[PDB]
């Protein structure tokens with residue numbers, strides 16, 4: 126049922142860990 | 155060889171240069187010195203201080219045709235970069251054979267007995283004919299100058 | 305002003321050395337040859353110019369340059385000719401003496 | 405975050421902005437100030453990569 | 455007379471004119487240290503309300519000034535090198551219509567129920583003049599007066615309170631005026647016609663900015679081991 | 693005659709130089725100079741609310757990302773102009789000279 130067929134545990138792991146170059150765009154990509 | 159290689163960097167170049175600085179919002183009061191009902195005598199110059207203001211130098215060239223417009227410290231085209239600190243505007247009526255004596259490096263009775271400028275001088279001396287305003291057929295005897303000094 | 309990276313009336317309009325410069329600048333003070341009371345042929349300066357001189361660029365052309373808001377020709381006190389040559393008398397000091 | 409922050413340092417230079425160095429100073433002094441900034445930024449990149 | 459020194463956490467001002475949103479900014483500037491000894495002068499402090507004597511306090515790299523005066527007894531501030539009419543001094547006077555900031559060689563006229571007389575009615579060699587709406591017009595009327603590289607910088611905040619002279623909350627002062635005065639400003643005399651004076655020192659502060667560019671809190675990095683930890687971590691939560 | 697004497701002092705003023713502005717162009721990659729702040733970027737209408745006192749905005753790092761227009765007092769965001777690396781996909785020159 127998820128937009129990405131991840132397990133409940135995988136979905137938790139992805140939610141618990143945290144083309145517009147919003148950060149440090151000073152020659153660094 | 156077959157593969158993907160990083161060779162350079164794309165950059166989008168600017169197409170215009172935008173210089174936004176505040177509404178100018180002031181004129182240094184230079185016009186009011188040149189444009190006056192009466193000017194001072196040569197012996198006693200009338201000094202007006204101009205400071206804490208922004209100066210439009212086009213008002214000098216647009217005031218009148220000039221007898222002499224010579225800037226010594228700063229080229230006449232380089233006057234627009236700034237007026238450090240404050241500037242003094244000395245306003246007086248002088249004769250045509252006396253105007254040529256008010257400059258760095260000059261000598262003569264008007265420079266020596268009425269008012270001298272330094273030889274190491276930063277500034278500009280501007281002169282124009284005022285025969286239309288100062289001369290009279292009865293004779294203008296209101297202006298004075300010193301001919302003899304100790 | 306005869307040095308790399310300098311500014312002034314000479315470095316800006318008469319003679320300029322490049323910032324990357326190899327060589328020697330020799331200044332010889334000889335008043336007995338180049339200083340006369342009536343004036344000295346060897347002096348010349350640029351007054352006004354449209355732009356700054358490039359290294360070793362030799363600008364030997366003249367036309368009236370107007371500092372005001374209107375065209376004019378020859379009106380020295382109102383507008384200036386590129387030549388503003390000044391002379392030198394033996395009575396003037398070291399900063400004004402001619403140097404070769 | 406540190407590497408970008410290093411762009412604000414002077415490393416002995418008059419200012420961290422190359423345009424201010426070029427606008428305020430003559431060419432050879434500006435070149436000295438730029439080399440001071442180049443040394444600082446290049447050292448910062450070498451630190452980041454190491 | 456002059457009252458016992460008090461302990462304040464006030465005197466924080468925006469160090470520059472840069473907008474910051476939801477960040478903690480660690481900056482080194484001249485600030486009133488938290489819990490520093492601030493002298494409380496109790497109208498006229500040591501002197502009485504009808505006495506012409508004045509502390510004429512020295513100013514060390516800028517001061518924090520505050521006073522709650524419903525009657526506007528304090529009218530202005532004079533800053534200068536010698537305060538003797540022999541050199542230039544900066545006269546700031548609020549006449550309830552406009553505030554006049556002048557730099558002149560002012561003569562001292564023995565300026566002051568609620569008696570009034572002319573104040574600095576005689577001066578010469580004037581070099582600077584500025585006029586704006588009044589600085590002050592039950593408000594605490596907090597000010598910071600700083601003098602750096604010839605520029606005389608005034609910051610202020612006006613918040614009301616009745617029950618206590620100082621609210622318990624935190625607010626930062628905003629720049630009010632920044633003038634190219636040039637005066638040395640070694641020392642200063644308060645002009646009356648009840649105030650607190652503290653002194654700024656070089657300190658590093660961690661300033662908490664809101665979503666909008668306003669400072670909502672601050673940590674004095676040398677006040678306490680916990681404050682120092684907050685500053686080294688750049689967080690208000692450790 | 694009016695003599696304009698320019699006094700050279702240490703005082704902080706030195707104020708009279710006029711400043712010539714240009715028109716404001718938004719949503720394009722331009723060079724800019726706002727009250728002495730210079731850079732290159734794309735200026736767009738901002739939703740940031742600067743205090744009447746504030747003139748510039750910054751990121752968690754010191755990169756400037758907003759300015760107050762000195763004449764309109766509008767707050768504009770500064771977006772860096774597009775930049776990025778380029779990679780070339782090659783089948784190999786012993787197969788084809790076509791690349792992506």
Ligand SMILES: *[C@@H]1O[C@H](CO)[C@@H](O[C@@H]2O[C@H](CO)[C@@H](O)[C@H](O)[C@H]2NC(C)=O)[C@H](O)[C@H]1NC(C)=O
Nearest residue numbers: 476663664665666667668670739740741742743
């Ligand atoms: C920041 O400033 C704004 C405007 O002054 C404050 O007002 C709120 O702005 C948001 C914007 O989406 C609105 O949705 C709210 O309804 C506004 N509130 C009110 C009472 O008008 C905003 O509150 C300020 N932020 C902080 C943290 O103080």
Ligand SMILES: *[C@@H]1O[C@H](CO)[C@@H](O)[C@H](O)[C@H]1NC(C)=O
Nearest residue numbers: 144145146147719774775776
């Ligand atoms: C590219 O821009 C368009 C709008 O111009 C947007 O819809 C699209 O999503 C963008 N590309 C990506 C990868 O998001």
Ligand SMILES: *[C@@H]1O[C@H](CO)[C@@H](O)[C@H](O)[C@H]1NC(C)=O
Nearest residue numbers: 459460461462463489620622
């Ligand atoms: C600190 O200030 C509080 C009031 O905010 C006061 O009650 C307390 O006694 C003060 N402490 C000292 C040491 O002055």
Ligand SMILES: *[C@@H]1O[C@H](CO)[C@@H](O)[C@H](O)[C@H]1NC(C)=O
Nearest residue numbers: 534535536637638639640641
């Ligand atoms: C403060 O005033 C004294 C008066 O004698 C003066 O000598 C001193 O130079 C002043 N301060 C500064 C920073 O000049």
Ligand SMILES: *[C@@H]1O[C@H](CO)[C@@H](O)[C@H](O)[C@H]1NC(C)=O
Nearest residue numbers: 176177178179762763764765
């Ligand atoms: C500048 O002048 C324009 C009108 O020409 C006005 O709309 C604008 O608000 C002015 N800005 C300032 C800062 O005075």
